[model samples]
Target chain A: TVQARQLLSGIVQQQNDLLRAIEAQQHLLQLTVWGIKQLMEWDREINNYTSLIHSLIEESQNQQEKNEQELLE
Target chain B: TVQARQLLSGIVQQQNDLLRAIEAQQHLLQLTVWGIKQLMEWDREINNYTSLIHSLIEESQNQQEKNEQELLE
Candidate 1:
């Protein structure tokens, strides 16, 4: 829990700093938006891949069980 | 408080998802490490900028106060 919390806190802190940096400087607007957008996409992909990985693992486990049943049959 | 915690938790959940996804695939190692490294650098830059912003704000406040005092003098 501590490790998880620390990682998340670190990321949130970064997001905060990035936002304030852009707030202080108009010139930083475009690039900072890109960076923040990248973070959003990265977060989305991470969730997608996690689900994909979980589904793959589940399918493989079932297949292994099916293989053992077929062997007995 | 809830908002802060949720933001942090959202980030933590994503980090957990990412770690698990990487663990499921060996080929993902290199790419994942690079992505993690970039995150480290991004975190660092965020902290650096935060400090810089804090310092700048202080400097401006001091300057403004000094200017007002000089005007009073």
Candidate 2:
């Protein structure tokens, strides 16, 4: 039964090691997924800001043109 | 074959349960991480706005002080 016990002990150790590795992989996967989500959100925000700036620049140019036309008249 | 079928059914049920649990954990982790990241981004944006406002207020105050000094002189 000593050999059986040794074999059983080895099996138990392997199971624990497997569990730990799975847990570590799960944690890493969670972080990676989270990073992807954050990047997606930041990307959306940047697009919004870019559009806003573009609109503002267009508006400013229009106003300048209007002022110049009035001055010329 | 009846005993084998029963054992296989049990194994299939256990495997389904494990898969469901893993999926639920993954979904929860994804949302939790996203929520934390959103809050972090909001915090950073708020900080930036606050700093900009503070600087503007300081600049206005300095301008006002300069105007007052000119009046006094």
Candidate 3:
């Protein structure tokens, strides 16, 4: 009966350990998802700014050329 | 002895399950670290380009202003 009680106690301990591990992993999974979402938003914002800067540069180049022609004339 | 054997078998199975769970979570942890590193690299690249583009636009504006002054004179 002592041996049986030891076995039961061990089993309960194992169950608790498994449950804790599961909860930890589940929390990690949620954090992973959140991190990916943040990266996505950062990527989108970066791309938008990239496009905006490119357009501005193009316009600046065109204006410079126009001014150069006027000065030469 | 029979009952004790059953308990022993159960204990072994529990150990195996716990090991498997640990291995799975370890893999996930590694992958999470990898994902974050990739994001860091991507962010660095985006910022570098942002600075380069801004510099180019500033230079273009300066050149345009010089040409305009020459034309006005």
- Among the numbered candidates, top lDDT falls to 3
Per-residue alpha-carbon lDDT of model 1 for B1-73, expressed as tens digits?
5554444344333333333332333222222434555667866885686577557655755655564455345
User: Model 2 segments beyond 4 Å from truth?
Assistant: A1-25, A29-73, B40-73
For residues A1-73, write the lDDT of model 3, one tens digit per residue.
6544444444444444444444444444444555676767866775686577557655755655564455345
Q: Quote the lDDT for B68 in model 2.
A: 33
Model 2 iRMS (Å) reads 28.3
**Residue-wise C-alpha lDDT for candidate 2, range A1-73, written one tens digit per residue:** 4543333333333323323333433443434445555667866775686577557655755655564455345
lDDT of 1 by residue, A5-72 (tens): 56654555553453334234323332443454476654555445445655644443443344333323
TM-scores vs. true structure, each candidate: 0.31, 0.31, 0.46
Error of 1 at B57 (Å): 53
Order of models, best TM-score first: 3, 2, 1
Which parts of model 3 are misplaced by more than 4 Å?
A40-73, B40-73
The C-alpha local distance difference test score for the whole of candidate 2 amounts to 0.45
Instruction: State which candidate has the highest TM-score.
Output: 3
lDDT of each: 0.45, 0.45, 0.50
User: In model 2 chain B, which range of ten residues has the least summed lDDT?
Assistant: B64-73
In model 1, the fraction of reference contacts reproduced equals 0.06
Q: What are the per-residue Cα lDDT tens digits for candidate 2 across B1-73?
A: 5774456345334433543454455455546556665666544543453444345334434433443333233
TM-score of chain A of each: 0.44, 0.52, 0.51
Report the number of the highest-DockQ candidate: 3
